[PDB]
UniProtKB/Swiss-Prot annotation, chain A:
Matches recorded under NCBIfam families: rplP_bact (TIGR01164)
Record bears the keyword rRNA-binding: yes
Assembly: Part of the 50S ribosomal subunit.
GO terms for biological process, alphabetical: translation
Protein known as: Large ribosomal subunit protein uL16
UniProt family annotation: Belongs to the universal ribosomal protein uL16 family.
Record organism: Staphylococcus aureus (strain MW2)
Alphabetical keyword list: Ribonucleoprotein, Ribosomal protein, RNA-binding, rRNA-binding, tRNA-binding
UniProtKB/Swiss-Prot annotation, chain B:
Protein name per the record: Large ribosomal subunit protein bL25
Full protein stretch here: 2 to 95 of 217
Function: This is one of the proteins that binds to the 5S RNA in the ribosome where it forms part of the central protuberance.
Protein origin, superkingdom: Bacteria
Subunit and interaction comment: Part of the 50S ribosomal subunit; part of the 5S rRNA/L5/L18/L25 subcomplex. Contacts the 5S rRNA. Binds to the 5S rRNA independently of L5 and L18.
Family of the protein in this entry: Belongs to the bacterial ribosomal protein bL25 family. CTC subfamily.
Swiss-Prot record, chain C:
GO molecular function: structural constituent of ribosome
Keywords linked to the UniProt accession: Ribonucleoprotein, Ribosomal protein
Entry protein name: Large ribosomal subunit protein bL27
Modification after translation (UniProt): The N-terminus is cleaved by ribosomal processing cysteine protease Prp.
Single GO BP term: translation
Gene Ontology CC terms, in alphabetical order: cytosolic large ribosomal subunit
Pfam family, one: Ribosomal_L27
Keyword Ribonucleoprotein: yes
Family matches, as HAMAP family: Ribosomal_bL27
Family to which this protein belongs: Belongs to the bacterial ribosomal protein bL27 family.
Keyword Translocase on entry: no
Amino acid sequence: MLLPKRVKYRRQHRPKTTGRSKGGNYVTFGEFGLQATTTSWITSRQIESARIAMTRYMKRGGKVWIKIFPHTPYTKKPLEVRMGAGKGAVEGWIAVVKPGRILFEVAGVSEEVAREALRLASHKLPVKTKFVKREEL
Amino acid sequence: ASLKSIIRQGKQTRSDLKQLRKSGKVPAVVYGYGTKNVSVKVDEVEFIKVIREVGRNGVIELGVGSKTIKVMVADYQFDPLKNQITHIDFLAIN
Amino acid sequence: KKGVSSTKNGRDSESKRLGAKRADGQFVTGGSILYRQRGTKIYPGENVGRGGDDTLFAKIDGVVKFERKGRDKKQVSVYAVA
RNA sequence: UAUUGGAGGUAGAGCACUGUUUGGACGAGGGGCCGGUUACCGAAUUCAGACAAACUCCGAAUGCCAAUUAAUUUAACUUGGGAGUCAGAACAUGGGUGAUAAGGUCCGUGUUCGAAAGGGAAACAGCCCAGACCACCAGCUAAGGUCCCAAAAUAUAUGUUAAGUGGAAAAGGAUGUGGCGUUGCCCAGACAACUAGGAUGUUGGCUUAGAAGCAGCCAUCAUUUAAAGAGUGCGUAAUAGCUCACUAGUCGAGUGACACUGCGCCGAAAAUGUACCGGGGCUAAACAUAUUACCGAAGCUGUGGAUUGUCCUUUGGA
RNA sequence: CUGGGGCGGUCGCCUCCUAAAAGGUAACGGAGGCGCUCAAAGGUUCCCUCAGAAUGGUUGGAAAUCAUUCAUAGAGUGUAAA
RNA sequence: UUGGCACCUCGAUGUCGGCUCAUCGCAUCCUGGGGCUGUAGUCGGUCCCAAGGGUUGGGCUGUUCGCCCAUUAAAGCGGUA
RNA sequence: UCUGGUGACUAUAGCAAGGAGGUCACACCUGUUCCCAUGCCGAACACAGAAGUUAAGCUCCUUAGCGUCGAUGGUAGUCGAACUUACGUUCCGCUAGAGUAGAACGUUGCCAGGC
Ligand SMILES: [Mg+2]
């Protein structure tokens, strides 16, 4: 869950960060889930930090599903350059999120362990989150 | 399985709908064999109690006017953040 | 002003004022272009012709009416009563 | 503007195409080997998920073009004489660029300033309200306001805050406080310290530096018992173990948790002098929801007066 | 021209996106092409339908050609893109 | 600090070091009060309150800086065109 | 409404399946001598003929597997407004896409023989 293997157009217009989650608002694979309540970017490197924390905290226990994939590339201009002269080069890959977009899913592990793991993941992550269970009823 | 409802009326604006949802009730519609397209609203808590009482599927008595309609939930809407039910669809079997 | 950094994409053509040129209901004289296009976004219908440039022009005088052909195709017509 | 008719593919959605992608089925190719088996790995084929300025089976709002046509308004075009303009600006909103930087830069769409006085924003071209023909020591209001500076409510009702919050931040942190549910327990008497017992064959087994709630596998058996665990637990040189598993009884009413909220708290350090209310000051003179007044402009009325235009002739009034 | 000059790059045409569903619309913004070619790759008349996939096989580098049912054109259209 | 922007100043706003004179902030170098510690006291480390005062003389470079030699309780960091 | 031409409609018209039927119309069929016939077959195309047979194409009838269509309610978005500087809030019109109920195994014009 790091980078797209290939993209057609490598320099792209930045994403819209205003509105609500187009989809992925439900726990489908796992049992418990973690959704977001604000809307920032995710940079293919903070989710890496988060899945490590969760996985290593479960001690290779139950399964994990990352629901957010970093698709959008972003650019940064070289240091101390003036304005103009083209667009800069790719610095990282991102995936915008929206309030209500589930991010991580877990199953095959007790409820309290899952809540603790998703808590520890939440702090390595730049968006306010919430703990959710597989919606039923 | 003896839930009751109330009959919706025409041109319920955004403000009316959102006020109605902000109180302990939720709009819905019924359709299917044996009836017509009647738009009603139900109190959320009793809907939830009935559903946990009967489950996903249940031939439910539904209170409209004076007539009770054998009805089951075709399908429903939910708001994941601010947990609250949004719109219930009902089909009658009879 | 920066320095040597340069881009390989600063080029474009001049847009061609294509699209519609008349609307349903107005009286067009014969020859009036109704829809400059490429390929066939709209096929000619009654009393309408196809130029070499896929342009659509009325054959005769009359009113103009856009209509449906089949499922996913549109034509154009001209009718003379005026 | 109302009503018809139409072109087009944005917002939003969607994955049917080009791709980009996360899990799960399912048989199989080079190949682990002897063409091989099985793992797989390159895909075929499915089921559930998602992402897109240069993807679209779909697809608004609004804009635009035009009408057999209505209703209200008053421009519009052609020809000729005279020009000035080619440095724009800020706000709001859709986008590019930059760093979802700039009082940045480049476009689109309003407005304003430019070329605009007046009231509000302390002061403050671009914000809010409003366009100054000229009097008047007349009246009504808009934005903003009504304890004093300083014209008007120390108005009325119902609630919220306790921080001077109001009158600058954030992730996070918290028995701050108010509301609405949901809830598991409780006169059989949950919850406190209820000073009431606390240990047994027994560390049994691996017993580990010997280590008997600590360097680590726990095999963690019934209860001496109203309440009991090869010890809830503070310990690590073995260990010395009372107390919130647990309630009769000190005695007698309540007491874990959960949501979703309204208002505060902490995070919070900068340079001449308070100095992040304009000052005083304010526990309402803050905030929320109603209601009723009043102040407030060069806006709009009232009276008088110029000067032009279009009407009636009321050759005068409009 | 130039986010001051200089250095580097660019200058005319076509296509696409940015471009806000008419048209138009800028930046040293994001992508590519052109300075030709065709006496048939023109006109007209009459005919014919494709890529791939397996049920596969004399070859079988796999798939050359051949066979058969599906193939919405996934193919072709002299060239860039629409 | 290195920059980005080009908004005042080109009918002129002297730009770097040093000297003289300072003045103010505190994210405190010393001194004063404390919580601590893997603090026995001296030792040190860490954090908090603290800005009243104090916070050297030289060798080398135009140097700021930095290194070095001796001291000191300390030889603080910045604003001030 | 049969049957065959012909053409009008957004596949409510189509695909697949099962089942009939050949009412003299329809295809199947016998052959290449005859015009013609094919870069390469009487394959087709054309042609002379009608002895065989509905098996298939065709026709009619069923069925929603499959295809398409598809509301109401809503939600997203947004025109205008009022707050506002919030990855905003409120009000008022308009109102998707997706999904769900459902429609649907066509309607139909002229002509010629039918009945
Ligand atoms: Mg001067």
